[PDB]
Design a protein around this ligand. Structure first.
Ligand code: HEM
Ligand SMILES: CC1(C)O[C@]2(C)CC[C@H]1CC2
Ligand SMILES: [Cl-]
Length: 396
């Protein structure tokens, strides 16, 4: 019996703690023998689980194309995910347009405003003694950030969340496509406004940009809007919700972060290794051999980062959250030419969120009368994390 045969990142067995980690640990064990295996799911595809096998695949851009970055393909109609869905040379030119606003110096500019935002969100319920850390905090922090990056109203998070649900999780394709079509309609109006009244945001930036002398098509612009919205509302919210869930029951990890705030950035990196939401696919475009296995053009390889992140040949004690772990070269943010554009920004965001939360609410736990829930998929993590805590005071 192999766990690869029915491996499916949208349908991962959950264990008693509520997470797929027991399943990930079992798959990791098997990957020591078979680091790449065939899955029967989605009509058949390769599941790449070993650390060095994922490295080999992801560096080999000649045989493995980012046209398969989402598998099954995300619902973005006729639009492509910019950067993430392209290969070089096209990929490099698009990414170059937004490197500056994602650079560490550019994104550090938001730290103090992320800190205020986190404290304001906390104020909303600190007096209540209860709340869903996902919906109340983890979702809202990146949504509000992302709205400001894109020059959108920050109070319309429920609209952006609905768009992201359509792209990734609605299963009736009619609803899926239709709601993505609503994103497109909003995106066009914003582009038209920024065209005439340009601002500081990243959208105005790409709208005014040029490649080889020429403006970006409206479709290219919509692709930029789309992938940026996905990074914030989806990946970051799921990551933070898993972190909040962990901090809720893991009283040992929590007291250490409270006592050693200087360890929080390194801890954020270890939490990324352990709770990294993401997997990505690659479309095989050339016959290629990786380890014992020969892949053919047209096949897809799914890079199961959470398994590689637990590889005993790449990490000592991989099943433990070791907050002082260095160098910690996990694959949660990718590697090589497609390496996460928002890497530094999420590190700031997580450091701020954790810092402020533990500062305001040092004592809290999972609500024993409400359920947690894990969202499965290409972006995976806690979706509901009901917590209780002693009633406290607003800063406002
Ligand atoms: C915890 C949060 C996040 C995680 C785990 C994550 C994960 C990843 C991964 C694994 C990749 C590599 C894709 C590949 O190899 O095909 C990637 C790329 C990318 N990410 Fe992130 N991401 C996060 C947040 C964000 C945010 C906040 C943004 C921007 C607002 C963002 C924007 C991008 C873009 C544009 C790419 C494509 C880069 C390229 O193709 O060169 N991500 N991300
Ligand atoms: C799943 C993953 C990693 O997140 C986004 C935002 C970046 C790359 C891919 C697809 C979209
Ligand atoms: Cl290690």
């Amino acid at each position: 019996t192999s766990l690869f045969t029915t491996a499916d990142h949208y349908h991962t067995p959950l264990g008693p703690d509520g997470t797929p980690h027991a399943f990930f640990e079992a798959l990791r064990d098997e990957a020591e023998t078979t680091p790449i295996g065939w899955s029967e799911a989605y009509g058949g595809h390769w599941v790449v689980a070993g650390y060095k096998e994922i490295q080999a695949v992801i560096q080999n851009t000649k045989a493995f194309s980012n046209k398969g970055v989402t598998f099954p393909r995300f619902e973005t109609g006729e639009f492509e995910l910019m950067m993430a869905g392209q290969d070089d040379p096209v990929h490099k030119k698009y990414r170059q347009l937004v490197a500056k606003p994602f650079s560490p110096e550019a994104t550090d500019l938001f730290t103090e405003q992320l800190r205020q935002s986190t404290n304001d969100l906390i104020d909303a319920r600190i007096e209540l003694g209860e709340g869903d850390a996902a919906t109340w905090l983890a979702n809202e922090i990146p949504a509000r950030l992302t709205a400001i990056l894109l020059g959108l109203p920050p109070e319309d998070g429920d609209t952006y969340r609905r768009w992201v649900w359509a792209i990734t999780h609605v299963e009736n394709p009619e609803e899926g496509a239709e709601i993505f079509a609503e994103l497109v309609a909003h995106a066009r109006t914003l582009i038209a406004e920024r065209r005439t009244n340009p601002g500081n945001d990243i959208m105005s930036r790409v709208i005014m940009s040029k490649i080889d002398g020429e403006s970006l098509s409206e479709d290219d612009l919509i692709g930029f809007f789309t992938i940026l919205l996905l990074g914030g509302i989806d990946n970051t919210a799921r990551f933070l919700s898993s972190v909040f869930w962990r901090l809720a029951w893991d009283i040992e990890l929590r007291r250490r972060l409270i006592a050693h705030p200087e360890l929080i950035p390194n801890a954020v990196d270890e939490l990324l290794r352990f709770y990294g939401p993401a997997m990505v696919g690659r479309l095989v475009t050339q016959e290629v051999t990786v380890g014992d296995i020969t892949m053919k053009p047209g096949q897809t390889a799914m890079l199961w980062f959470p398994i590689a992140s637990r590889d005993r040949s790449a990490f000592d004690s991989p099943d433990n959250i070791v907050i002082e772990r260095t160098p910690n070269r996990h694959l949660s943010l990718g590697h090589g030419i497609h390496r996460c554009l928002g890497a530094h920004l999420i590190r700031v965001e997580a450091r701020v969120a954790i810092t402020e939360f533990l500062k305001r609410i040092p004592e809290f736990s999972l609500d024993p009368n409400k359920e947690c829930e894990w969202l499965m998929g290409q972006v995976a993590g806690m979706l509901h994390v009901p917590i209780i805590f002693p009633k406290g005071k607003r800063l406002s």
